[PDB]
Predict the structure.
Amino acid sequence: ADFEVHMLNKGKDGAMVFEPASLKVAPGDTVTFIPTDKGHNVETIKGMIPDGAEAFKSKINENYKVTFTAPGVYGVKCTPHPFMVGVVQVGDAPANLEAVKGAKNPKKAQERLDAALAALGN
Ligand SMILES: [Cl-]
Ligand SMILES: [Cu+2]
């Protein structure tokens, strides 16, 4: 299955958001990150992807497709915007939940990550 995540200056969750900010996918599914407004990108957060997964980074304004196979949670961020974060989860019972959940980001970033994890049923 293929999914889309858009990058926005403003959403229900406030300034600088991924929409949706959480997505549960099956191994082999893809997500394309599509900027709706200028000035955004996507990249993995340091230490927040599974064993077996590779880090990634897009250019500002670039449509960027990633295939997710390794099970677990994947924290993503936007380089220029500090609060702009999201989580992609592959499978059930992710093994690296604590890497995201137990992290120490600014309050707004951490609350968005934590809400994403809860939305995903963790
Ligand atoms: Cl592009
Ligand atoms: Cu952004």
Remarks:
- The pocket of chloride ion (ligand 1) is lined by residues 62-63 (CB under 6 Å).
